[PDB]
Structure formats: structure tokens, C-alpha cells
Design a protein around this ligand. Structure first.
Ligand code: MG
Ligand code: MG
Lengths: 255, 255
């Protein structure tokens, strides 16, 4: 009845965040890195369909996936590489926040989503900076101890963001909703040596919805934010409006 | 007041689905492919952050993005490559459905999501097969004519799935919610010439929620499915449960 954890991330088997978390979890659970071989912060919920995947296994046992996305890593971990199957997926600790409408772009979150059907809700854990990995590890371990203490009935993935603060300064925990940003609009051009313009994706838009119940607000104020996530992208509140619109413009109806 | 459309997809500037749609839209709108240079059905909402992006432009004007994901293509299209800015993003026609809980993995949908802040709701259009691109083009054009006829008040992206049927056999339109599947669990091993096991991601799980109001049910029955989507992954119905759970297990509270 020791927890079997598939530990993945967005930064690969080596990032200090995953290495720090690995050390911490091994104190009380059996841990298998199934993680990328190398930075996939771009990756979102991408996965490899047109190619087979190769691993490689470091001397310390860190199962790793060549050119693997975080979702690839977790899918292979759960369905092939782990035996017996993991009880839970943990993804992190990510160096940097995964907050607001950024979460759909997050590989850290994606790895957790890929573990959503396991016995325990998956955890994605992101540190709001690069200093206090131990704070994020302590928060993760508390959550894991909670799950063993008592099952979480509703909510299949928890998106956890930890303030980059010494643990003593973390004020508590807040259950939050995702905030949002204004549209990101910047493109940074840079010419190559031959004078061709290449384009970088610019920084995220300014915060739009960062009210007190948001993940943004909780982290800014020094709380751990926990947002339950799901994968259903249906905008349920739009249903009647879209239906009425179609009727009004006569699309899909003769009359 | 002719519509300016940024047309992208998951399959690149050339896939017959985008080429067929391009031909159809140009009859009444100004169209710029900003699309990948080549198949990115793996891509989901991935985007390129650690590298700059290079384009290339075919003789027919098809702006294309080297190693570009669908989100890269739309972001660059909207913010840099299109002038004046597009009025709307259209992504498709995809060869194959984007239904249920697959939509978070879909590059076609991702390209549309990336156009969600424009004046008109973005459209992702997927054909449930590879035959009747003209059917999907006709449905797309009807929707676009609807949007010009009257603005859609709520709902920022519409995920459209078209039955792979001659238009005359399409029964109508249904506003739907996303269905879901059982966990996908298959991994297909295949050895390389040196005897190393490589792993393919297997097929999706069996359908779980495919009730009549679902996108799955509508398409199966020969209707166009239109699901309004958003990017907020918050599982709002889990809030109280997670809060109560934390209190119960004493995580985040001293008492
Ligand atoms: Mg990262
Ligand atoms: Mg595709």
C-alpha cells in the first residue's frame, strides 16, 4: 500500500525541479520517472502519432523518451513501461508558473491530464520561479499524504501552483479557478545572417481576469493555488445562444 | 466589408482539405493561408518558444511555417504576417473527425483556438473521412455567410464536424457538447532492425459518453455537429468537493 508514482514533467529526466521532487517522493513512495529525455515547455498536449518512440534509460533508472512529449511519456509510462501500473501521475516541479489560460499550452499540465483516469487524481506542480523547489516538494508531499488519508471524490486532475517562497512564508492553500489574459499580440523579429526575417513568439498578454478566486490572485498573495481541471472544452454557457443564432441566420434549417 | 480569412489547418499548406476549402472561400472572401509547411496531427496546442520560426512562401502565395505548429501558424498569421489583420480564423478542412475528448489533442482545433480573440468566432472544420470535402466546404461557407448576416454574441470558437456524406444526405445541424471516451490503453510495440523495442501510441478508447446531444451522436446520425469551445480548463463542479477534501485531510490548514 506504498504509492506507485509515475513522475514526469515538461523539462526532462535531469531539470532540477523533477530531480528535487524525485528525491522527496522516494522517501515514502516508489517512483519511476517516465519523462522526456531532454525542454518541451512548448509541447502542450502534443503527442507522437506518425512515429514510434524510443526510450533510453540512464544509470539511475530515469525511464526517458527520445523526442518524447510529456503526454507521450505518461502514455507510455502508464500503458507499457510501468509494471505494476502507477497509482498516480505527478508532473513537476516545473520551473515557472502554469496559470490562467496558459494551462492549455502547458506540457506539465498535459502530463497530468494524461494520468487522469488512474485511481488517484493526477497532480501538476509548478513553482512560480526557480528558487524554492523544496517548498513545492513539501506541498506536493502534503497533498499526496492527503490522498492516501482520504480519497478525492470529484476532480481528476489538480493543477498546483506554488509561490516561490520559503515554506514558512506560504500563507496557505486556495481552491481556485483559472484566470485569463488579454490576447498575446507581440512577435519579435530577428534577422538571420543572410538577412531573412525570423519570428519569435512574444510574451503572454497582460492579465485580464485575476480576481481573488483566481489562480493568479492566490499565487500573487503567497498561497498555494489548487485548480481542479478537466479536459472537456465544451463552452456549455454558449449552447442556447449558438442554437438561436443558427435558427436566426437560417443555417441548418430551410425556414 | 469582404471577409479577410486566415486559413490554417493541421495538415499544411498543400492537404487536399485545406486546398479544397481555400478554393471555396476565395469565391467570396480574401483568404491567406497562414499554415504549416508540411502532417502535424500530433500537435495539439503546441507552439514554438525556444526557437524563432522561418516561413517560406509558395508560388501561389501559400504563407507557410517551417516546422510550424498550427498554433504557431495562426499566431504569426494574426500578429505579423497578415495585413490588415484577419477578421476570422478558419482551420480545416481536416481529413478526419475532431470529436469528444480528442479535441484537446487536435491541431485543427488549436489553430482555431488561437484565433479566438478576433472579431468573429473562429471555426475549426473537420470531415468525418476523406471523401466529401465539398460537403464540408459548403457547410463552412454557410456558417461564414451566417456570421456576416448576424454576429454571434456568445461563443468564441465553433468546433464543426461534418459527416462524410454528399450534401444532400446531411440531415441538418445540431449544437452539441463534446462526448468522451474510455481511457486509451494500447501500445503497439515494434522492434527496430537491431532488435530494440519501439512503441507506437495505440488507437483511442471506446466511446463512453456518446448520448444524443453529443458531437459523436450528431455526426453518427448524419448531422453537422457544432460545439462551442473555450480554453478554460477549470472543472467548476469540483470546487466545493476539493475544498472540503483539503479541510478534511488537513492540507493547507493547521486544524
Ligand atoms: Mg516547463
Ligand atoms: Mg489532421
Amino acid at each position: 500500500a506504498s504509492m506507485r508514482i509515475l513522475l514526469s514533467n515538461d523539462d526532462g529526466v535531469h531539470a532540477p525541479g523533477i530531480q528535487t521532487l524525485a528525491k522527496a517522493l522516494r522517501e515514502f513512495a516508489d517512483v519511476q520517472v517516465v519523462a522526456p529525455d531532454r525542454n518541451r515547455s512548448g509541447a502542450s498536449n502534443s503527442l507522437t502519432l506518425e512515429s514510434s518512440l524510443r526510450t533510453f534509460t540512464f544509470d539511475n533508472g530515469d525511464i526517458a523518451v527520445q523526442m518524447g512529449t510529456p503526454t507521450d511519456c505518461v502514455y507510455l509510462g502508464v500503458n507499457a513501461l510501468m509494471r505494476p501500473r502507477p497509482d498516480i501521475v505527478v508532473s513537476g516541479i516545473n520551473a515557472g508558473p502554469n496559470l490562467g489560460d496558459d494551462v492549455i499550452y502547458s506540457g506539465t499540465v498535459a502530463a497530468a491530464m494524461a494520468g487522469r483516469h488512474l485511481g488517484f487524481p493526477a497532480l501538476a506542480v509548478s513553482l512560480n520561479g526557480y528558487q524554492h523547489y523544496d517548498t513545492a516538494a513539501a506541498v506536493t508531499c502534503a497533498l499526496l499524504r492527503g490522498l492516501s488519508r482520504e480519497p478525492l471524490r470529484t476532480g481528476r486532475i489538480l493543477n498546483v501552483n506554488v509561490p516561490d517562497l520559503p515554506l514558512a512564508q506560504v500563507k496557505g492553500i486556495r481552491v481556485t479557478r483559472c484566470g485569463s489574459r488579454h490576447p498575446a499580440d507581440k512577435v519579435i523579429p530577428q534577422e538571420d545572417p543572410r538577412g531573412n526575417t525570423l519570428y519569435w513568439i512574444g510574451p503572454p498578454g497582460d492579465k485580464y481576469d485575476a480576481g481573488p478566486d483566481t489562480d493568479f490572485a492566490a499565487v500573487d498573495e503567497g498561497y498555494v493555488s489548487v485548480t481542479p481541471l478537466h479536459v472537456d472544452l465544451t463552452a456549455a454557457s454558449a449552447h442556447d445562444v449558438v442554437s438561436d443564432w443558427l435558427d436566426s441566420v437560417g443555417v441548418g434549417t430551410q425556414w
